[PDB]
């Protein structure tokens, strides 16, 4: 379509498939989000990574 | 006009309906989004982060609440003594309510996947010991002794330079998903039990404390997913919030 | 130009956020691979060092003998929009005939969604949130009856004149957006953009909005974030004469196009006041249930 | 090789022979603000070595009965060194931090501290105990300066949230039988590109004993906890006269 | 005006017309008038089996 | 008919809704549009035009209102004297309300950009002088002396053949946009202060007036934009307009 | 808005009408279907037994 | 005195950094500013009264009777536009009756 | 479409993207305007332009 | 707290028994003459 880029997610590393009937994109449906995850950001934010087989503190 | 005909559902307001609504501010543009560290994309990212499991969920007086975060071990005078026990059900009242996993679990009716509990020993460097941590799948009653606990899934933990050990509670279920287990017919969905025994003994030399504590950290494995979004059992307000 | 070596080999000004981790697609739960017995020295997946700050990296396959399981379980329902794009009550406005509160056919509600616990606890799982929203307005009498009454809803951004009567000149609404709807019509519903001067709304602001001495008299401003203050929602019965009916307006919000940053521990004590984390010191409760001993269920 | 470490920044070097790796908060290193995220137009000043260096600010004594403490950033440093001066003379500020918490005992002592960084750490009050009074925390409690402040109710972190879940934040543990320090690198966290170092604390540092300190009578009973920290990639803008509040 | 709410197992069941549970922040609810046509929705296959 | 189903929002009249409405006069054609000078396309075009800033917003009696448009300078007997001060906040009550920028600002909730104030000296050709005009960013209190004012952004102005000087108030904010600042928590959005000092002195020879006036003209720079259209704080009518 | 005109049948609830209704649980995914013996596809299969 | 506005910019008065400005200018177009419906007329049809008491009223079209709208349009001398008119009717209490 | 050129903006140096369901174009939505600006018309209408670096009155 | 503002090393006792403190050449002149009380204190290196 030919609307404005009003949505709160314009420039998000994940892309959506939404529906809209208005010139402003924030009026659009929530749609579908891509299913990417990065748990290491929270669960394993160590500088020097350690493998599963080794002893963590060597 | 173009011929149309209204169907049931007309005028209803379904709170989960994903529709389109008239925008109040035409041509409005939001403040750009700068880079902010720590963006989360899926709740499952948080379920994999270990938080403290309150195995010792017994003291309730406000001045002793911190004691819930750790449980003890000490020199036993003998053999195969029981140290602690708890249900492995993540969305059931009890120890898991202290974990973020437990809490996020509250917003979903069903779950599936393996769990893991990592136990960190915090005694002195001079203290040694071996513990047997067992997971008893559904149907097995609370083990009366170490000899019956040892028949289920288990890890024998040796204290040492690596302070911690992980007990994986593998997904062993009859159904693909479990709903939250509770007393009654929904006990059909129970995960089972975890029990900790002394494999040998907590041993220490002259000069080191006779009692030490273990801190448990729990989370889900990568095969863990949840479904059927629902409201949590708790509503944290009494009257109106002012 | 820069001639001294230290200026040339300087990293001052590097604006690239160097990230140690990256997102991978993950539409289903992870599968399980076949594993067998391992009786080996040196290799030890069960042993960890929680002090490091990371979660355990031990998997089912390395702790017990596993079969192969092909896992098709979807991860779609735990995306932020799945979790948050569900409308919940965030406001309630009373327009009674006789009364102490809003007795004159109009009311001004400062937009704040922290007055209701279900919604508040969910959003506070994160520190920063950016999203668009759909607002639905359900109006009726206090018994839930539908009466033939015309209402006007007006959004009053900060600095726009707030009405002070059912006949305020401000209701001319020449620039502010207004919705005229009958109680007999379906609930009014509109889309709202992300409006903060900041890149995100923040449920927690550890600071003060202004400079100066922070004397006890003005401590009610600790944690006050003007960037979350979007204005006033004003409602009135459309007339110069008083309405024949007592009314109630319930406000529902549904977030969409959601982004969130910095997860935090979830609320474990009852909420007492709006936008402030005070809890009752005499009634600090354990997060969950208790039992009599650590050795019995 | 995971246990030994040396941190050198500015004219300062820290060593440790009993480390447990390094945590890089949210898996992201600190960086300067880009030309697209920035909004303020004056050319910033980036003092470098004179402000990005380690400052040892305080020592607490760990006692068998200790509750835990917190410090607020950048509050702890606004009155120290060249960093403090810049934070005072400029309206805008931004930086990351390398935090190094120190605590050594002996192979016969025991205990475990949780060292965590919680962004936007808003303090709450007990609401007059009954919960009927909307009281607010005073300035000395929200921004304690270099002295830090002691937690009154560690279980709910003086803010109605469970310390049991604090590990969802960048953290390390100082478990005496294992290590004697915690090192956390924190990038600048805010919803704005720059902000006031005085009016806003971006995050709080929490040092809380979870497994209490213990030892037999006769072993050194004074076990200090020292806090050393270094700003990283500091930038300042909006220059005028010096202001402390 | 009526409110219909689906309460999955484990979600709090309302115990009064004023229960806090009616905030319905996650459960699906339908608000409809008796004067409107019959409310109607689609439901997926929900068993753990 | 084709099956449809009505959704919430049905029948509402949203005043900012950009829809299609039935035309009342079919096949009607408007009078053609001839060329007219001065067409404006964007309000931002008007924000860049300088209008008179009432720095001297003190006299209120109808016969002295014109005095608000200019402020004075005169021979001082000494050093570093304060001449005038005002807040730089364009959408705040005060001096800026006299400017078109200030007024247009009233129709928008947020703004962003640099501002500029041009000061024109209107004394005799024989009068000389140097003034220090300073802009103090947020957090700095009103400078007590020229020595503290001089530490902020400033211009030292020399009277001469070029009658005027421009003080740019650069965009120095923590947020990408500012809402209108006012006493209270919204002072969070204040732009700061402008103060004018005597750098040397107003000097004149025998025969020229000892007092002269300065006229200030203010406007926005090209990086200035506004967002979130709203109604202005004033409504210029008391009762009904007849 | 786009010009439409309502026809008879409007608002009726015909129990055999095969229409589309708003889904109550967005992005919900059912438990997969494993193989189960004895699936029937048509009642006529039973009439022959 | 020339009659022009100052041409001095931030860059020439202080030392500036580079700022890439993505802030939109779309909301200050004339349609953004004016294409918002405001009250321009009010007609009373009372039962008993001095004004329009006989079930009908004639209103000469003039939008200058209400200040919010009038002040905005008077920012310009000449204006050319199309318009959408909406008519909201009810009793003086805001009640809806079958009329 | 195939309507009449009834709009008040037919022949405007700026083009719009509107929606309409009627034969008269003035019935159309407001749409989007192009974002061109000419501030010099008001802020700098001098016959002989002067640069930023020079002294205005030479 | 004031010592910590200069050049420093935080030393941790452990398996490596020793630590080195480098006193970097930080002088105004290219060379220093021997420092002593009086005007030649101009050449002092500083304190540890
Ligand atoms: C014509 C009706 C329009 C109604 C307009 C509603 C606008 C609502 C904007 C969403 C704001 C999100 C909530 C923001 C902040 C929080 O409520 C608190 N201030 C946090 O302290
Ligand atoms: C069936 C209902 C049709 C209603 C027709 C409304 C036509 C209105 C035309 C717009 C006129 C714009 C206002 C023009 C002039 C000003 O009001 C004053 N005369 C200025 O002195
Ligand atoms: Cl469960
Ligand atoms: Cl302002
Ligand atoms: K027809
Ligand atoms: K899979
Ligand atoms: K229409
Ligand atoms: K039909
Ligand atoms: K640009
Ligand atoms: Na391992």
Outline of this structure?
Chains A, I: It comes from Human enterovirus 71 (EV71). Chain C has 297 residues and is mainly β.
Could you give the topology of this structure?
The structure is cut from a larger assembly and holds two copies of chain A (58 residues), four copies of chain B, three copies of chain C and one copy of chain D (245 residues).
Chain A: E1 36-37, H1 40-43
Chain B: E1 2-6, E2 13-14, E3 39-40, H1 43-47, E4 51-53, E5 71-74, E6 82-87, H2 100-105, E7 108-112, E8 115-121, E9 130-136, H3 146-149, E10 153-158, E11 164-169, E12 178-179, E13 193-198, E14 211-220, E15 225-229
Chain C: H1 5-8, E1 24-25, E2 47-48, H2 60-63, H3 80-84, E3 88-95, E4 106-110, H4 117-123, E5 126-140, E6 150-156, E7 178-182, E8 188-192, E9 201-202, E10 232-237, E11 247-263
Antiparallel strand pairs in C: 3-11, 4-10, 5-8, 5-9, 5-11, 6-7, 6-10
The structure holds sphingosine (2 copies), chloride ion (2 copies), potassium ion (5 copies) and sodium ion (NA).
Function (chain E): Capsid protein VP0: Component of immature procapsids, which is cleaved into capsid proteins VP4 and VP2 after maturation. Allows the capsid to remain inactive before the maturation step.
Subcellular location (chain E): Host cytoplasmic vesicle membrane; Host nucleus; Virion
Family (chain E): Belongs to the picornaviruses polyprotein family.
Describe the structure.
The structure is cut from a larger assembly and holds 2 copies of chain A (about 60 residues), 4 copies of chain B, 3 copies of chain C and 1 copy of chain D (about 240 residues). With about 60 residues, chain A is largely without helices or strands. Helices cover about 5% and strands about 5% of the residues of chain A. Chain A has 1 helix and 1 strand; from the N terminus they run E-H. The longest helix of chain A has 4 residues, at about 40-45. Chain A starts with about 35 loop residues before the first strand and ends in a 15-residue tail after the last helix. Chain B is mainly β and about 240 residues long. Chain D has 2 helices and 12 strands. Chain D has a 5-stranded mixed β-sheet with strand order 3-10-6-12-4. Chains D and J meet through strand 2 and strand 4 of D and strand 1 of J. The site of one potassium ion (K) has 5 residues of chain C, from loops. Chain E: This is Genome polyprotein.
